[model samples]
Target: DLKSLAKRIYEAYLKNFNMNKVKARVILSGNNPPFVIHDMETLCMAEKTLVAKLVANGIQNKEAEVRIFHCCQCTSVETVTELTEFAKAIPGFANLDLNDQVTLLKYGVYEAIFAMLSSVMNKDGMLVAYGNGFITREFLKSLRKPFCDIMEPKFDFAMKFNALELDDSDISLFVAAIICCGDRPGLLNVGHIEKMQEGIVHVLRLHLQSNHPDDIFLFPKLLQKMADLRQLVTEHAQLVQIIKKTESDAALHPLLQEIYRDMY
Candidate 1:
């Protein structure tokens, strides 16, 4: 499965570098789920007014940046307070409070409505880094942590129109991985690969498996296809590295790995 994916990228490159050059590299990494926090005393009041305004303006509240986090269900109050304190730290933050200090603990009802407004006004589609200049003024600023991954931003931009970008085998593997995830009961089901490909919010909640082994089982050969495809693309493509390497060097894993990692 993976080999075929790689081959297509190789073939595309051979057939048309103009088309293959724009392909985006994909990386796999763990991420947390979005959370919510609020000072109930103030939040309960402002949240209502915020909801009303959203309704009045006919703003459909959907689509916004989601920052995932881990929380204990039983000890929610403290978690919530910490989150509220987190929220207060933003530059223009105000959950109707005096002492504000972090990114809102978690976006709450009011925060959601405010976030919708921000999204609506920001129709141009942009992403902001946590410490990017003046970003603290926004309501959904995700606090920095260890996170790394790669994806093609929705190809609505010039790349898509030009066919300059190619969706590589990793993407095919990712889609296959999602199909594998959906088969299990207790594990995160990756049924909607397309949506995930589009950065859509997923149904699974991020949490540790609270069991005896203290580990989780990866689905049966979930990423095997992706691995296979990555290899295939490197073997046959007209990548400069392939041309530079001697016949014996073709089997070198690092060279092949570079092709899979960098090219497709």
Candidate 2:
């Protein structure tokens, strides 16, 4: 029953957040110039100009001039909203009281974001922001101290997190467990939340056992990632505060503002 419930939640999450569903891709012909990079060609190009490539592809204009920061802010706005809707659609989540729902969302959305961010990360050197913007680690470090600091740890965590190779179902149950966690400071029904979390955890472990039969440690490792996510998100909140102080009223997305306000 828990597996069925987990499966149901996974379905709902895909309905909301599937990247292929949300963004269109253009497949190029073999003869196309941009499509020429493959096999030894790809390797040769990378070895020759990887640094040049990153610097060139990385947005060189000022953050304001290129509006890259604004684009990223909009992405955050959409992601948080989608995560909220995804949580509400989870089978048992809507049964909770409204205050409990908000409390869980406030505490857990960024943690969910941490997991979602992994889908777009690559150890090669770039993160695909919102599945469209290509942001290199070097480009991130090129920014102001506060902004770059917020991203580097996430990049570090993401590479390791991606290594675990979780699919959509794992992400769904893990995110639900993160939301239903009992320890969030303002949870009104701690016992109820804990019970819900236990069911999710149970379902997650069983699912992982079936999906990753060779890896006995994967389940516990994921649990540790949740703890890591909590720490990372806390650091992210502090960095956001620093950005707010530095940027003042610069076009920060409204929902993002609300999420940050709720987070702090």
Candidate 3:
């Protein structure tokens, strides 16, 4: 029963990230609109901001500092929006009570964001404050104490996870599993969430099995990464709380504000 449910869940996940496939077919058929010549670049940049001023002076340059703050908040908003929409697409998710939906999202968004960070991170550096700039590992460490510590383990995990070279399909399934986690505090329908999570994991295992038959260890390795993501996000929440208190100028977006309020 769970196995079949897993397939259905994966199908729902699949639909969310593959609109590019439709675009590709239209291109092949040569029936695209006349203005679509520039649409390709627009499509690529749809979810990313094109310009950002790097804060090389930390907080000295108020303009650059505010730019960095807005960039971070923007990235958080975009990430949360995508995560929320994806969660809503899951079969039983919209059926849950509204409070339960927000609870799950509040608890799970950071974990999902960290998991998605694997796509933007590398061993030498990571995209900073959002996708605005790349900060080398050395430069990032030279910043503050725990602020620097926040990204080191994330980069380590990302490098290891990226080595597997998972495609968009793999990421979608993994993110769905992260969102459906039932162990978060304050969830009313824990049993329902657990069932959904179990099904997602089942599907992910099967996907890895077929997709990476030569690498028998990858399935378990990915499961272990889920635990790692949970730990990383917990630390991230603490770091964010500290930043919010000390850096009054770095206002969080309203969506993230609600998430932080509900997270505890």
lDDT by residue for model 1 (1-264), tens: 323433442343233221111221110110321112222332223324433342232344321211111111112333233334333222223322231111112112122111111221122222221111111112222322110100111112223212311132222222222222222222222334233322211111111111112324322222342343334333323332442352332233332233223332
Each candidate's lDDT (Cα)?
Answer: 0.24, 0.68, 0.65
Greater-TM-score candidate between 2 and 3 = 2
Model 2 lDDT tens row, 1-264: 866877888887888774521231222111222212223334234323432332253444234312445555666777777888888756567888899988888888888887777666565344333332344566566655555565678789988987887787787778877887889877788888888788778888899998889899999999899999998988888877777778653466777776677565
Which runs in model 3 stand beyond 4 Å of their true positions? 1-66, 127-139, 142-150, 262-264
What would the C-alpha RMSD of candidate 2 be, to one decimal place? 7.1
Summarize candidate 3's per-residue lDDT along 206-253 as a digit string, tens digits.
877876788999878888988888888777778778877877766667
The TM-score, computed over Cα atoms with residue i paired to residue i, of candidate 2 is: 0.78
Highest TM-score among the candidates is held by which one? 2
TM for every model, in the order presented, reads 0.18, 0.78, 0.72
lDDT of 1 at 249: 21
**Which sections of candidate 2 miss by over 4 Å?**
20-66, 125-130, 262-264
